[PDB]
Amino acid sequence: DVGNITAKMPTLTEIGGRVNRVGFKRVEIKGKLEKYGFFREYTQEQLDFD
Amino acid sequence: DVGNITAKMPTLTEIGGRVNRVGFKRVEIKGKLEKYGFFREYTQEQLDFD
């Protein structure tokens, strides 16, 4: 918006002084790990006689 | 006896398992020993004057 930008511009006078201060920030991102698996069983007789 | 023998035969299925366990035994025997003996005595004049 033009009005908000104009109304909050960092103007400076002749005397200066503590008139405009700013700050900065950082955030963090995460991750994870998981384990999966599956198995199968059988017998010998269900292989030879098939 | 055919019934008793066929009722205790070591049959097996297709999954195995803990079945048909056996054992053994042993027995000791002994023998002995002993001593024997006997003697005879006589006099000198028995032989001379006979």
CA atoms of A46 and B14, how far apart (whole Å): 9
**B13: nearest CA in chain A?**
A45
- d(C-alpha B23, C-alpha A14), whole Å: 111
- Interface A–B counts its CB contacts (< 8 A) at 5
How does DSSP assign B4-49, residue by residue? HHHHS-----TT--S-------------------------HHHHH-
Find out whether A45 and B14 touch, Cβ atoms under 8 Å: yes
Report residue A3 CA to chain centroid gap: 33
**Rounded Cα distance, B14 and A45, in Å:** 6
Q: For A47, which residue in chain B has the nearest alpha carbon?
A: B14
What type of residue is A49?
A: F
Within 8 A of B14 by CB-CB distance, chain A residues are 43-46
What is the residue whose two structure tokens read 């019934």? B3
d(CA B47, CA A33): 122
- Are A44 and B14 in contact (CB < 8 Å)? yes
Q: Specify the experimental method.
A: cryo-EM
Q: What is the resolution of this structure in A?
A: 3.3
Identify the contact set of chain A against chain B, taking CB-CB distances under 8 A.
43-46
**Which pair of structure tokens corresponds to residue A30?**
């995460």
